[PDB]
């Protein structure tokens, strides 16, 4: 693994020392996840410190936990401090290239959120904003307020234009497969989405590749990120 940037938070070698709630630790074990992977060991402390992050990583590296477990922890703290109102949120947004990936990530979020609620946390609310859903479905969930939203870029753009969603309290934005999303034509939509932020945000970008178009994108999207590169082998 290769890490670049100033002020790199030290790596943490176990999930327990990363301070996840017990319900999360129990759920990792139920999923057979016992020890962290290299991008988790270095990436989770980076995200928990509040820094922006570039993860050069692909499926199999354990990237998904890097960008899903911190945002659940942040939302849980926020919901305790001040319960979310109807029409409030999202606080955290994950954008990905495909319906099947968004569904998968959303289900991961709801899994951990269910585990937390079975252990006397509040129930956090997670929205899926993709194609093949009606105005009806989407409007419904956003009516109750949303902690976390998982979206594909064209659908999110539609919702933002129609003022059905607002990014006014969104403080966390993760881009999963940013290379794939730009190759598929969504650069403009993603860049436009960033301009819907009225205030500051922590931005995470995950990509298996890093060609010049993506290097330039990341320069525009992120601020002083820590880069973590798992390597072509790992």
Residue numbers in the entry: 169 to 402
Q: What does the published report state?
A:
In contrast, DEAD box protein 41 (DDX41), a member of the helicase superfamily 2 (SF2), is unique in that it can recognize two different types of ligands, double-stranded DNA (dsDNA) and CDN45. DDX41 consists of two RecA-like domains (i.e., DEAD and HELICc domains), which are conserved among DEAD box proteins. These domains have several conserved motifs, such as the Q motif and motif I, which are both essential for ATP binding by the DEAD box proteins. In this work, we determined two different crystal structures of the DDX41 DEAD domain in apo forms.
We determined the apo-form structures of two constructs, residues 169–402 (DEAD402) and 169–399 (DEAD399), at 1.5 and 2.2 Å resolutions, respectively. In the crystal structure of DEAD402, helix α2 and the Q motif are located adjacent to helix α3 and motif I, and the N-terminal residues (169–173) form a β strand (β1) and participate in the core β-sheet formation. We hereafter refer to this conformation of the N-terminal region as the “closed” form. The closed form of the DDX41 DEAD domain superimposes well on that of DDX3, with an RMSD of 1.56 Å over 215 Cα atoms. Especially, this superimposition revealed that the structure around the ATP-binding site, including the Q motif and motif I, adopts a similar conformation to that of DDX3. Interestingly, a malic acid molecule from the crystallization solution is present at this putative binding site for the ATP phosphate group in the closed form structure. One of the two carboxylate groups of the malic acid interacts with the main chain amide groups of motif I, while the other carboxylate group forms a salt bridge with the Arg residues in the adjacent molecule in the crystalline lattice. This observation is consistent with the fact that the crystals of the closed form were obtained only under conditions containing malic acid. Thus, in the present crystal structure, the DDX41 DEAD domain is trapped in the closed form by the carboxylate group of malic acid, which is bound by mimicking the phosphate group. Consequently, the structure of the ATP-binding site is completely rearranged in these open forms, and thus they do not seem to be able to bind ATP. Therefore, these results suggested that the closed form represents the ATP-bound state of DDX41, while both open forms 1 and 2 represent its nucleotide-free state.
